[PDB]
Design a protein around this ligand. Structure first.
Ligand SMILES: Nc1nc2c(ncn2[C@@H]2O[C@H](COP(=O)(O)OP(=O)(O)O)[C@@H](O)[C@H]2O)c(=O)[nH]1
Length: 293
């Protein structure tokens, strides 16, 4: 009748789909990505809190004192307040690709005490579904995995399977964090949050699943103001038009409101541009439209 809270690492070389899977695990209808991907002192990438379960996702396999201290700062807690250890490692790879980078990551998991799960991502993207079996057996001989589960972070295929395992490894404990805590204080992130919020405000009942927001460009001008490029991404074409809305008024208003809330929070000028793109490729009219004024 009490609670569970713990640290779950998500690891794997760049591009295997770590952030994509993280987002499917957080389960927000609108998600945020960042093609900049930078390293923080506390290594928290996201927090999933549902009922009595709080999963704290990090991007290092093990937490070292410097980092527990950074995590305590983030929460504004006395630096000697206790912090547990990574309880489960999600090792992520893509389809049947296997490189020395993949191995460098593996090397640091045996170095640890925590059980490792092997999430074979981009499974949807495998050419000959045959190649899989032999590869998986080769993968399995690399170390004792608690489990091996092929997934598509994009589709959601098997991600619930990862979730359920994660829940199982949360030690009994009080939650560290408040339910909706901001772990990324960067202005760049704050811009995303505002767009996501305006999307949720104005789309209402029509707003689909799997929308993601992303800030392609964040700069300060000479005028001590700001220039921001926002990119809103949707699964299918029909959705792209609900976002733009009848006569382009929907995306027009969203932009106006977001640029407003943005100027207020940044106490500075803001020029905001917003693009709606369908994940699977731009388009002919759109690409040619992109490179303009
Ligand atoms: N086809 C396919 N692409 C994926 C899948 N998961 C992620 N991707 C793509 O992989 C690219 C990078 O994923 P990302 O999470 O940002 O990489 P990472 O955080 O550096 O590991 C993105 O364009 C994703 O859309 C998947 O399950 N299938």
């Amino acid at each position: 009748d009490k609670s569970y809270c713990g640290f779950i690492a998500i690891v794997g070389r760049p591009n295997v789909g770590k952030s994509t899977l993280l987002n499917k695990l957080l389960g927000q209808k609108i998600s945020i990505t960042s093609r900049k991907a930078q390293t923080t002192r506390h290594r928290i990438v996201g927090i999933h809190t549902e009922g009595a379960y709080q999963a704290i996702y990090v991007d290092t396999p093990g937490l070292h004192m410097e980092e527990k201290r950074a995590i305590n700062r983030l929460m504004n807690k006395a630096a000697s307040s206790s912090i547990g250890d990574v309880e489960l490692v999600i090792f992520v790879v893509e389809g049947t690709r296997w490189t020395p980078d993949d191995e460098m990551v593996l090397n640091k998991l045996r170095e640890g005490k925590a059980p490792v799960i092997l999430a074979v991502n981009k499974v949807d993207n495998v050419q000959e579904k045959a190649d899989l079996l032999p590869h998986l057996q080769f993968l399995a001989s690399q170390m004792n995995f608690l489990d091996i589960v092929p997934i598509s972070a994009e589709t959601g295929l098997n991600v619930d399977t990862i979730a359920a395992i994660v829940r199982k490894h949360l030690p009994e404990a009080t939650h560290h964090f408040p339910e909706d805590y901001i772990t990324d204080r960067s202005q760049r992130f704050m811009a995303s949050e505002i767009i996501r919020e305006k999307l949720m405000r104005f789309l209402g009942a029509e707003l689909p699943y799997s929308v993601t927001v992303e800030i392609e460009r964040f700069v300060s001008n000479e005028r001590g103001g700001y220039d921001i490029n926002g990119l809103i991404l949707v699964e299918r074409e029909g959705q792209k038009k609900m976002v733009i809305g009848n006569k382009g008024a929907k995306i027009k208003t969203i932009g106006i409101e977001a640029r407003k809330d943005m100027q207020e929070m940044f106490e500075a000028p803001v020029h905001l541009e917003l693009w709606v793109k369908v994940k699977s490729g731009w388009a002919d009219d759109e690409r040619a439209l992109r490179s303009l004024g």
